[PDB]
Amino acid sequence: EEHANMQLQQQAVLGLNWMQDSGEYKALAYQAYNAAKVAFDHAKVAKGKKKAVVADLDETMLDNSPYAGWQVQNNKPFDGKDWTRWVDARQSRAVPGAVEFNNYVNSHNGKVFYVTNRKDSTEKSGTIDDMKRLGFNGVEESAFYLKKDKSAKAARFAEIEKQGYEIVLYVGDNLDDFGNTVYGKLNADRRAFVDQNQGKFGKTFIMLPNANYGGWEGGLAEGYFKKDTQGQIKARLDAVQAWDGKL
Amino acid sequence: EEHANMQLQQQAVLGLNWMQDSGEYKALAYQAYNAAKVAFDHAKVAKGKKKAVVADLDETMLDNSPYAGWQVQNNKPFDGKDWTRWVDARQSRAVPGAVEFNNYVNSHNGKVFYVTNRKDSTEKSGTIDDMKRLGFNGVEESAFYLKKDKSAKAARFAEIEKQGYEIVLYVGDNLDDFGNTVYGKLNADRRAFVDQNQGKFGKTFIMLPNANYGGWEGGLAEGYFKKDTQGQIKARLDAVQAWDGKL
Numbered sequence: 062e063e064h065a066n067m068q069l070q071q072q073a074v075l076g077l078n079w080m081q082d083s084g085e086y087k088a089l090a091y092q093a094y095n096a097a098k099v100a101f102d103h104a105k106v107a108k109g110k111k112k113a114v115v116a117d118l119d120e121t122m123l124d125n126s127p128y129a130g131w132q133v134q135n136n137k138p139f140d141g142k143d144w145t146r147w148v149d150a151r152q153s154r155a156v157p158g159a160v161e162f163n164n165y166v167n168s169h170n171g172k173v174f175y176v177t178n179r180k181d182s183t184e185k186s187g188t189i190d191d192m193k194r195l196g197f198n199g200v201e202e203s204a205f206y207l208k209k210d211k212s213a214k215a216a217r218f219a220e221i222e223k224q225g226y227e228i229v230l231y232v233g234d235n236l237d238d239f240g241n242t243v244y245g246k247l248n249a250d251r252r253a254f255v256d257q258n259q260g261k262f263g264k265t266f267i268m269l270p271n272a273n274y275g276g277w278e279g280g281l282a283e284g285y286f287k288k289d290t291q292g293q294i295k296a297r298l299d300a301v302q303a304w305d306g307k308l
Numbered sequence: 309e310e311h312a313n314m315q316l317q318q319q320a321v322l323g324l325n326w327m328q329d330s331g332e333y334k335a336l337a338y339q340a341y342n343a344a345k346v347a348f349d350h351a352k353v354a355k356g357k358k359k360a361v362v363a364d365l366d367e368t369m370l371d372n373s374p375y376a377g378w379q380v381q382n383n384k385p386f387d388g389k390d391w392t393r394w395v396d397a398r399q400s401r402a403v404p405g406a407v408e409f410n411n412y413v414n415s416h417n418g419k420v421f422y423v424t425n426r427k428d429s430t431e432k433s434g435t436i437d438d439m440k441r442l443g444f445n446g447v448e449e450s451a452f453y454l455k456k457d458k459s460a461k462a463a464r465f466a467e468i469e470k471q472g473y474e475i476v477l478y479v480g481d482n483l484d485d486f487g488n489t490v491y492g493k494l495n496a497d498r499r500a501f502v503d504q505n506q507g508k509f510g511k512t513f514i515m516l517p518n519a520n521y522g523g524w525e526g527g528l529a530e531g532y533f534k535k536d537t538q539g540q541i542k543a544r545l546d547a548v549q550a551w552d553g554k555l
């Protein structure tokens with residue numbers, strides 16, 4: 062139903078305005094990358110290890126907000142086929158502070174590895190071209206761990222460690238960018254993970270804000286991503302905690 | 309029109325789900341307060357000054373998301389009269405990490421002052437009661453600079469300084485929590501302010517995320533807050549930056 066597609070996508074509008082237009086969003090991005098630099102500079106690794114930083118791409122280093130804008134304007138729920146065309150369009154922007162942090166790490170005895178669920182087979186060329194254009198250093202193909210068979214990222218983190226690196230910090234917009242322990246889990250478990258790691262945030266786990274999509278969306282309800290549009294609308298509305306209007 | 313009120317409020321749903329339900333939101337709050345503690349501990353003030361921290365309340369230390377939930381469920385645009393009832397309902401929650409940071413500052417040779425646009429005359433009693441209940445220390449009336457005649461906050465910051473304090477850092481969710489220079493201005497000027505202060509974020513300006521409301525909403529269009537509901541909907545949709553769907 063067109064009506065349902067419209068309602069689902071309209072629900073993203075205010076958060077999209079915030080991400081695209083606000084100075085507040087920029088300030089949060091700068092806050093994250095300023096904290097990340099401090100953590101990188103303080104980091105020490107085991108003898109014989111090289112220093113690695115793991116960075117997510119989408120909504121962490123790369124800004125894909127125009128794709129979300131297209132979804133709103135065309136009443137289009139997420140579809141991987143549309144996403145692949147967006148990547149191929151080579152119009153990604155950089156998240157504020159990301160390029161500077163990336164290039165600083167790479168020029169100060171570190172290496173940033175991009176662990177991302179952009180697809181290795183169909184989305185790599187656009188990703189690399191955009192990152193070169195946006196000014197990122199160190200975007201040779203071997204710096205990338207794009208998605209092959211698994212969306213969970215822990216195995217790719219382990220690959221990096223096997224190459225003689227110690228990962229000193231992780232940057233992401235999704236808790237699944239920090240490991241697998243709440244991958245595919247609902248939001249109660251995801252909040253619990255955050256509470257159990259409270260002291261790591263802004264130190265070894267660096268967060269960027271993303272009010273538009275993520276593991277928290279699936280986290281709204283069991284089997285969310287398999288529900289139809291009406292089901293996803295209902296899941297969102299049922300998750301709302303509301304004042305009853307009484308004293 | 310009921311239809312317009314519905315559309316305007318539905319546009320907040322996804323960002324509200326994110327703020328209310330996600331672990332990611334909690335992680336951003338912990339990141340902010342972890343960074344704030346580091347900045348406080350590092351701060352030095354002029355001889356003879358006392359150390360102050362200025363903190364915003366709404367969506368910085370206090371969580372009012374159930375009011376937003378009520379707006380969504382009842383198709384209610386913001387109204388100060390409803391807000392006053394919400395405050396009186398004494399159901400505010402605490403932003404994660406805020407109480408711990410607040411109490412740490414107050415027990416380590418600092419003082420937190422609450423500079424907030426909750427209203428001094430009608431909203432003070434509920435604010436103080438909620439903060440006591442939530443575990444904040446140092447919530448005697450003199451710690452508060454609630455709104456009297458002006459929403460811009462710089463004059464209240466100056467009052468604090470006149471009492472012999474040097475403000476070592478500011479915590480907020482709205483750029484207007486850091487001064488007056490972009491108060492009432494559109495988002496281009498607000499983004500420019502952030503760029504001009506890039507290095508301060510996560511150090512002396514501590515940001516909390518708020519995708520639901522703020523100076524950035526008014527910042528979407530000249531005279532936004534005076535437009536009718538249809539006008540505000542149009543302003544939001546016109547602000548959207550969208551991919552054209554082409555390569």
Ligand SMILES: [Mg+2]
Nearest residue numbers: 117119120234
């Ligand atoms: Mg991402």
Ligand SMILES: [Mg+2]
Nearest residue numbers: 364366367481
């Ligand atoms: Mg506030």
